[PDB]
Design a protein around this motif. Structure first.
Motif, PDB file in Angstrom:
ATOM      1  N   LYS A 176      44.523  27.596  39.008  1.00 47.55           N
ATOM      2  CA  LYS A 176      44.620  28.622  40.039  1.00 47.55           C
ATOM      3  C   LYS A 176      43.986  28.132  41.349  1.00 47.55           C
ATOM      4  CE  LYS A 176      43.642  33.570  40.552  1.00 47.55           C
ATOM      5  NZ  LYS A 176      43.990  34.212  39.250  1.00 47.55           N
ATOM      6  N   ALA A 177      42.811  27.521  41.249  1.00 48.62           N
ATOM      7  CA  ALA A 177      42.104  27.014  42.432  1.00 48.62           C
ATOM      8  C   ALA A 177      43.016  26.076  43.212  1.00 48.62           C
ATOM      9  CB  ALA A 177      40.829  26.284  42.019  1.00 48.62           C
ATOM     10  N   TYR A 179      36.310  28.379  44.578  1.00 45.06           N
ATOM     11  CA  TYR A 179      36.442  28.631  43.149  1.00 45.06           C
ATOM     12  C   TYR A 179      35.341  27.959  42.333  1.00 45.06           C
ATOM     13  CZ  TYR A 179      41.190  30.441  43.919  1.00 45.06           C
ATOM     14  OH  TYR A 179      42.272  31.154  44.334  1.00 45.06           O
ATOM     15  N   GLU A 180      34.828  28.687  41.349  1.00 45.65           N
ATOM     16  CA  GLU A 180      33.974  28.112  40.322  1.00 45.65           C
ATOM     17  C   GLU A 180      34.664  28.320  38.970  1.00 45.65           C
ATOM     18  OE1 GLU A 180      31.026  32.103  40.258  1.00 45.65           O
ATOM     19  OE2 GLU A 180      30.181  30.128  40.715  1.00 45.65           O
ATOM     20  N   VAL A 181      34.481  27.374  38.056  1.00 43.28           N
ATOM     21  CA  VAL A 181      35.138  27.424  36.754  1.00 43.28           C
ATOM     22  C   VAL A 181      34.144  27.103  35.640  1.00 43.28           C
ATOM     23  CG1 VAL A 181      37.363  26.800  37.777  1.00 43.28           C
ATOM     24  CG2 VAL A 181      35.932  25.006  36.787  1.00 43.28           C
ATOM     25  N   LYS A 189      30.171  24.903  30.404  1.00 41.31           N
ATOM     26  CA  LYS A 189      29.714  24.218  31.610  1.00 41.31           C
ATOM     27  C   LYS A 189      30.415  24.778  32.835  1.00 41.31           C
ATOM     28  CE  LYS A 189      28.090  20.709  33.040  1.00 41.31           C
ATOM     29  NZ  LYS A 189      28.174  19.503  33.905  1.00 41.31           N
ATOM     30  N   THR A 190      29.686  24.881  33.944  1.00 40.46           N
ATOM     31  CA  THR A 190      30.245  25.387  35.197  1.00 40.46           C
ATOM     32  C   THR A 190      30.378  24.312  36.263  1.00 40.46           C
ATOM     33  OG1 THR A 190      28.193  26.069  36.319  1.00 40.46           O
ATOM     34  CG2 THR A 190      29.191  27.624  34.743  1.00 40.46           C
ATOM     35  N   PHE A 217      44.417  17.957  44.986  1.00 37.08           N
ATOM     36  CA  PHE A 217      43.841  17.669  43.689  1.00 37.08           C
ATOM     37  C   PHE A 217      42.457  18.290  43.609  1.00 37.08           C
ATOM     38  CE2 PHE A 217      46.747  14.372  44.960  1.00 37.08           C
ATOM     39  CZ  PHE A 217      47.418  13.975  43.818  1.00 37.08           C
ATOM     40  N   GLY A 218      42.263  19.123  42.602  1.00 39.72           N
ATOM     41  CA  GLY A 218      40.945  19.669  42.284  1.00 39.72           C
ATOM     42  C   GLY A 218      40.366  18.903  41.111  1.00 39.72           C
ATOM     43  N   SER A 219      39.055  18.680  41.149  1.00 39.09           N
ATOM     44  CA  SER A 219      38.362  17.959  40.084  1.00 39.09           C
ATOM     45  C   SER A 219      37.047  18.619  39.684  1.00 39.09           C
ATOM     46  CB  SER A 219      38.098  16.513  40.500  1.00 39.09           C
ATOM     47  OG  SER A 219      37.494  15.781  39.445  1.00 39.09           O
TER      48      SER A 219
END
Ligand SMILES: Cc1cnccc1-c1cc(C(F)(F)F)cc2[nH]ncc12
Ligand SMILES: [Mn+2]
Ligand SMILES: [Mn+2]
Length: 368
Positions: A169-170, A202-204, A209-210, A256-258
């Motif tokens: 989603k992020a 965004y946080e996941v 683990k966050t 790209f999110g990592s």
């Protein structure tokens, strides 16, 4: 004529008249003055200019429709248990049929990326690769179609474990933000900064683990030229270059999110290669090197290819010749790009057309 299931009817047979569906059409974002760019829609000179390139836009649209129907078919059968080779061959078979492959005039624009987990980009299996897709895997399916060198570069991320939903989603949102911020006269850095701001809001939580989702700072969107996947201008996905996008240009908008460091390094065995668009003609006497360059020129020109595609053309014992072409700088290798072991990476990508009259997300679908 309607499409089959599985898809096998070429896109041009679905639109006998040679007129292919448009992508999503958008008004360009307002300037810093606050002034609207709506005037472009109704302008006489812009409508003329836009019509001059109709054949071109129409080519992208054909390529984009193939892309839409291919990925929809893929999303319906991609499952853990399948080998990466099986996934790539099945996607590619479908892609060949629907694009109606015809040497350099219509075909696959670059190899099917299916980069896994910490690897973000430029992984496709070479022959003998026994990697199997796993339930917990996060897979970036990035594949391209073209008609007359009008390339659709478009990608989405595949998961099976709902634990990654927010990461996906992020990145989707970040990609859409870039697409929204993009427009004629827009500063590339501004798009980058905007993309970063959304991505990082965004946080996941993955397995207790966050993380704050980080853009991969050393990966980017890019200008697209004809038979030329990266045409010279880069779009940062972090706060970048103040160069501006220009009318009539074509862009791959990718983010790209990592959960890792947010940086990729060259890792694993190389599979992706592509001829240097700027290398002139070079006489080669070395017989196997000469033969392989000829094969590359006839089959891919300046479009990227992979080793599997050489195998399927019946080439073998070509590794040294391919290394030679790289060392001579006629071909460049594009090895997989990976964040730190244990990180998760996600990607979404669309091709956009900076048309004189409007901005067209030519590869947009119902899916993303
Ligand atoms: C040529 C290039 C230069 N700088 C960054 C990325 C690429 C690139 C390379 C390939 C590849 F590996 F197929 F050559 C596929 C791509 N899709 N989007 C960008 C892209
Ligand atoms: Mn891509
Ligand atoms: Mn790209």
């Amino acid at each position: 004529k309607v499409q089959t299931d599985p898809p096998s009817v070429p896109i041009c047979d679905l639109y006998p008249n040679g007129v292919f569906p448009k992508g999503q059409e958008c008004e360009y974002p307002p300037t810093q003055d606050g002034r609207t760019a709506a005037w472009r829609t109704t302008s006489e000179e812009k409508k003329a200019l836009d019509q001059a390139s109709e054949e071109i836009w129409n080519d992208f649209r054909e390529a984009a429709e193939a892309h839409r129907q291919v990925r929809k078919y893929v999303m319906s059968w991609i499952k853990p248990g399948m080998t990466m080779i099986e996934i790539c061959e099945k996607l590619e078979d479908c892609s060949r049929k629907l694009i109606k492959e015809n040497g350099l005039n219509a075909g696959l624009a670059f190899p099917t990326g299916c980069s896994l987990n910490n690897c973000a980009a430029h992984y496709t299996p070479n022959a003998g690769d026994t990697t199997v897709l796993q339930y917990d895997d996060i897979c970036k399916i990035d594949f391209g179609t073209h008609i007359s060198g009008r390339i659709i570069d478009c990608a989405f991320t595949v998961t099976f474990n709902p634990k990654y939903d927010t990461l996906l989603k992020a990145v989707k949102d970040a990609t859409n933000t870039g697409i929204k911020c993009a427009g004629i006269d827009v500063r590339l850095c501004d798009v980058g900064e905007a993309i970063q701001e959304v991505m990082e809001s965004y946080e996941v939580e993955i397995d207790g683990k966050t993380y704050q989702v980080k853009p991969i700072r050393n990966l980017n969107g890019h200008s697209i030229g004809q038979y030329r996947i990266h045409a010279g201008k880069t779009v940062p996905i972090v706060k970048g270059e103040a160069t501006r996008m220009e009318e009539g240009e074509v862009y791959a908008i990718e983010t790209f999110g990592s959960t890792g460091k947010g940086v990729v390094h060259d890792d694993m065995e190389c599979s992706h290669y592509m001829k240097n668009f700027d290398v002139g003609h070079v006489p080669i006497r070395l017989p196997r090197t000469k033969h392989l360059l000829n094969v590359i020129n006839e089959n891919f020109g300046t479009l990227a290819f992979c080793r599997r595609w050489l195998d399927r053309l019946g080439e073998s014992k070509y590794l040294m010749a391919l290394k030679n072409l790289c060392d001579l700088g006629i071909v460049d290798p594009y090895p997989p790009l990976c964040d730190i072991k244990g990180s998760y990476t996600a990607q979404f990508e669309h091709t956009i057309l900076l048309r004189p009259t409007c901005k067209e997300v030519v590869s947009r679908g119902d899916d993303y």
